[PDB]
Design a protein around this ligand. Structure first.
Ligand code: HEM
Ligand code: HEM
Ligand SMILES: [Xe]
Ligand SMILES: [Xe]
Ligand SMILES: [Xe]
Ligand SMILES: [Xe]
Lengths: 146, 145
């Protein structure tokens, strides 16, 4: 299967659930981006070494490099959400960010580690399993490129 | 100083940035690709840096260029959204500065984007006042390079 295949398979219902949840947990990109990363490092401590450029990622909001990273990650997600209705456009931005991760030797399975943290941050805003599953389908579009 | 450069974004400059972005940022694919092709056409000595993207003369038809160009416009979106808070603007500017330092882009070469910005804004009826505002934002990145 192709990335385009994965992008084309996102249905109206999945896109609605992505948009509805993103309206909330994408609204505070600094706060929720840093929370997402902090949750990744709490539950997947084996990934911390990949992020050495950011310095001490336990410093959370106080760490300027972590904050800048985290905000920018949330604009990658903003970009994806805004491209949902045009698979051509979604694929080309997914492929861009996939290259960012391939050059860091991040596998499809490793990228998929983000689903745990997304599920938790969603649940902190009372978006439950249906929303986590929708986000896993979007994550899987990136995995198709990895 | 990146912090001193950020301090140049006064109330009037922030307003001009926001007012012009409401138009410029409303079509990120079309306007992003137009900005890039203007850069390449008018500054051909920069094209070599973009080798990953392949044949950039293909413009919109080049998938890698399209993905790059959309994403660039979300960097600008990010900057606009940080204008309220100099500390946050600086940390995202520094992030993107690192991206350009790895590509061996200097402050002077980054500043080559100002001609293209002036041109594409003028075509949308945002003139020198708006170009100058965007130049002040570009200068924040330049200070970090
Ligand atoms: C929702 C999921 C994710 C998104 C949207 C995302 C997005 C990003 C973005 C936008 C960057 C900056 C790229 C650059 O400037 O070169 C980045 C960097 C990075 N990402 Fe992710 N990422 C995600 C998940 C992950 C996961 C789960 C891992 C690892 C297991 C990972 C590892 C990395 C690494 C190592 C970097 C480089 C950090 C640095 O040195 O600047 N990413 N990511
Ligand atoms: C408004 C001004 C600009 C902004 C906001 C901007 C933004 C970006 C962004 C967001 C990326 C992706 C970074 C990554 O994923 O590693 C990037 C890549 C790049 N930028 Fe810029 N950029 C600007 C101007 C310039 C200029 C003027 C030059 C060169 C003279 C330049 C050279 C590059 C290069 C060579 C890449 C890497 C392309 C690739 O191989 O993927 N940038 N830029
Ligand atoms: Xe990504
Ligand atoms: Xe994603
Ligand atoms: Xe930038
Ligand atoms: Xe900029």
């Amino acid at each position: 299967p192709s990335v385009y295949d994965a992008a084309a398979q996102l249905t109206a219902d999945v896109k609605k659930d992505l948009r509805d949840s993103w309206k909330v947990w994408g609204s505070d990109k600094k706060g929720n981006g840093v929370a997402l990363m902090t949750t990744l490092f709490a539950d997947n401590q084996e990934t911390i070494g990949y992020f050495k450029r950011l310095g001490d990622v336990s410093q959370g909001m106080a760490n300027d490099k972590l904050r800048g990273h985290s905000i920018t990650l949330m604009y990658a997600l903003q970009n994806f959400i805004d491209q949902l209705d045009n698979p051509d456009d979604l694929v080309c931005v997914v492929e861009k960010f996939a290259v960012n991760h391939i050059t860091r030797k991040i596998s499809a399975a490793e990228f998929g580690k983000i689903n745990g943290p997304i599920k938790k941050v969603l649940a902190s805003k009372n978006f439950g399993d249906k929303y986590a599953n929708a986000w896993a389908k979007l994550v899987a579009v990136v995995q198709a490129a990895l």
